């Protein structure tokens, strides 16, 4: 039940995000149609200052170009090269992989106990909200 039920959780989540987009889009159109009115400004510009900033930040320049595809230009060349060097080497060592299965299991439980203890720590802490 659990393993193929992940489906519902993922599906639900995506549906959530699409509904969020529509929510936002409906929220937004209720602020253009009732709202002009041509009143609208005040607070609006501040929204608008934030939005301006973020937007061409992004743009422009800089980012896009350079970075995204020095990375994609790049990635691929490393792909080509890695393949061969590969070739071989020569098997390997896979094999001996079974455990180190096993010992990681035991580190996993130790970490899960520490995380839940930190979380409780700060509980025993907001209460330090004293």
């Amino acid at each position: 039940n659990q393993t193929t039920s992940v489906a519902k959780i993922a599906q639900y989540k995506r549906k959530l995000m699409d509904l969020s987009h529509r929510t936002l889009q409906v929220l937004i159109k209720q602020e253009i149609q009732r709202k002009s009115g041509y009143a609208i400004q005040a607070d609006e510009e501040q929204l608008r200052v934030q939005l301006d900033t973020i937007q061409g930040e992004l743009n422009a320049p800089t980012q896009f170009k350079g970075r995204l595809n020095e990375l994609m230009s790049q990635i691929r060349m490393q792909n080509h090269f890695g393949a061969v060097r590969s070739e071989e080497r020569y098997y390997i060592d896979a094999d001996l992989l079974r455990e180190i299965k096993q010992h990681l299991k035991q580190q996993q439980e130790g970490l899960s106990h520490l995380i839940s203890i930190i979380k409780d720590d700060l509980e025993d802490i907001k209460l330090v909200e004293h």
Binding site: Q55, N59, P61, N69, M72, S73
Partner: protein, 74 residues
């Protein structure tokens, strides 16, 4: 003229897009500007392709760099 052109990328103005488009055919700088300008991959690629195909002398190394860039936008 000022070679302020890089600043041009920044300008948001709705007027700007048509400006670049009309001017698009030292125009190459305009185009280097244009593909860069297009955040969108598709539009950017279409330009570099034309850039490569273009009749002004541009080295093949660049022609290919355009394609390498354009292809990446795939």
């Amino acid at each position: 003229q000022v070679d302020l052109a890089d600043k041009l990328l920044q300008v948001a103005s709705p007027f700007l897009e048509p400006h670049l488009v009309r001017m698009a055919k030292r125009y190459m700088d305009l185009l280097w500007r244009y593909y860069e300008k297009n955040r969108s991959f598709s539009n950017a690629a279409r330009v570099l392709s034309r850039l490569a195909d273009m009749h002004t002398e541009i080295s093949l190394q660049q022609r290919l760099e355009y394609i390498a860039r354009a292809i990446l936008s795939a």
